[PDB]
């Protein structure tokens, strides 16, 4: 009932083509919506109700799976939360064989975050599977990151990401990004370094990233008007900063 749909057909294309779909949007458009549709369509299309990754920050994991809970009750949901026995559990919950697709089983969708997805790697190193998706992307900007490292080692041979802002402009986390979505072309930084610096950065990445932005549709948003408020020095604080700057 939007143009998300022109969306999820292009990166369909995309992933026709074999190589792996970028969405860099900001959040407020619905980019769960899109999600969901996008399994939906890949779940009538190739006929797969299998492994369905999805890795999200501590805060949104209920509420996406609460959205699993009324937006498609077809699915059947696995959370990934809980203390040792509540993990063993559901470790034996999906005790996984053979690969491939299957129709009845109950981790059809199934969420974590990434703590325990990098302290219990050992774990999660086998059972591979077909689709990586994780939400708001910015934490792995880091060049010697522990996260990095034991996604790194995954067989899923998938790389959708899903963020708000990439454009940190860390000169390694795109490269990391751009490692992420290819890992066997782009290996070497040093090389990525060394190849009118602007015009050319910009068609760098020009087939992978989506032009959207916030101001296409009609505002019944609010239209968020930033208003400073500027403060003067109380007695403490002036003694406080005298202090500090005395110390420097």
Not at 42 to 69: D, K, M, Q, Y
Not at 209 to 224: C, F
Request: charged share 20%; with cysteine; net charge positive.
């Amino acid at each position: 009932k939007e143009y998300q749909l022109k969306g999820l057909n292009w990166l369909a294309n995309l992933y026709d083509q074999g190589i792996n779909g970028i969405l860099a949007d900001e959040m407020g458009l619905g980019k769960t919506v899109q999600s969901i549709s996008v399994l939906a369509h890949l779940a009538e299309n190739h006929n797969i109700w299998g492994p369905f990754l999805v890795v999200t920050p501590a805060s949104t994991l209920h509420n996406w799976v609460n959205e699993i809970s009324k937006f498609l009750p077809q699915f059947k949901i696995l959370p990934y939360w809980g203390n040792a026995n509540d993990r063993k559990v559901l470790r034996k919950f999906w005790d996984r064989k053979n690969l491939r697709y299957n129709k009845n089983a109950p981790f059809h969708v199934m969420v974590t975050s990434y703590q325990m997805v990098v302290t219990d790697a050992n774990y999660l190193q086998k059972m591979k599977w077909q689709y990586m998706i994780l939400d708001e992307a910015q934490a792995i900007k880091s060049s010697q990151s522990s996260r990095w490292k034991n996604l790194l080692s995954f067989h899923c041979r998938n790389r959708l990401l899903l963020t708000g802002t990439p454009i940190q402009n860390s000169m390694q986390e795109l490269w990391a990004l751009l490692h992420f979505i290819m890992p066997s072309l782009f290996d070497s930084h040093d090389e990525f370094n060394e190849w009118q610096q602007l015009r050319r950065l910009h068609m760098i990445l020009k087939p992978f990233m989506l032009r959207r932005v916030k101001k296409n549709v009609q505002s019944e948003l609010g239209d968020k008007i930033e208003i400073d408020v500027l403060c003067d020095l109380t007695q403490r604080q002036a003694k406080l900063y005298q202090v500090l700057k005395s110390q420097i």
